[PDB]
Symmetry: none
Subunit: 152 residues, 2 copies
């Protein structure tokens, strides 16, 4: 399985709290989108294959599996404008994190080639360890804003 | 994109499905009498470790791809409504065969990104084609225009 770093669990709750309880939304478009984040993990240092896979799944799974019910309308709006715009360019770090908790199953045929699964698993965990190390800069309530009384 | 060959038998239905929706403006009756979960189970009962991995995988991709990849524009409001009503139900529990089939014309792009080596990839594709053979074999039952109805007056204006 994909173990989430302990250091990142509290953020997972704060993320859920900001959206779900405080009725706030992550600032869209993102100032530090998924693309940017993946590009930095890459340069830091195949990785290319890893970064592409993460992006593709994110682009498919956001909108379908990574949004809380309170964020749907906000999502409908970004699409309302550009229905073909990439999601990995609009959203940021918190949503990228959500992917890893909703990917443990979305990594589906891999269990077949146990040797590859291990490898891939190794890279996902390392990337996760990367996010964990940089939590300070990546996950912050500063990137969230209260939703307009209209949004409701 | 990884090449997933669609059984010739099923190609005409693919056009009919597209027509029913985008031309005739009909909708697949949604609480599906025979859902993706049901179908996947029938296949499994029909036929292993690989079989169980393939079925579970198909379901995961369906639930992850429906909504953003498998719907024609005219079906989006129906989907949004389904989502508002049942936020806890996986799409494989709501949708049926026609949509399950659409998954196979789009799944190849996703496979393009996978750590499965050559042999393992080959094995996956052989099983995906085996599943398709199963749908084709049961086409008269699984794919029917009779499961579609003209969308209500209220629907078009959405």
């Amino acid at each position: 399985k994909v173990k989430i770093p302990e250091e990142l669990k509290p953020w997972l709750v704060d993320d859920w709290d900001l959206i779900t309880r405080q009725k706030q939304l992550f600032y869209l478009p993102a100032k530090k989108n998924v693309d940017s984040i993946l590009e930095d993990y890459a340069n830091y240092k195949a990785v290319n294959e890893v970064v592409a896979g993460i992006k593709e799944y994110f682009n498919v799974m956001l909108g379908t599996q990574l949004l809380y019910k309170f964020e749907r309308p906000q999502y409908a709006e970004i699409l309302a404008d550009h229905p073909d715009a990439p999601m990995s360019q609009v959203y940021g770090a918190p949503h990228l994190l959500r992917l890893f908790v909703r990917i443990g199953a979305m990594l589906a045929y891999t269990p077949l080639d146990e040797k590859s699964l291990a490898l891939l698993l190794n890279y996902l965990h390392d990337f996760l360890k990367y996010l964990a190390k940089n939590s300070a800069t990546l996950f912050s309530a500063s990137d969230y804003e209260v939703a307009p009384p209209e949004y409701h």
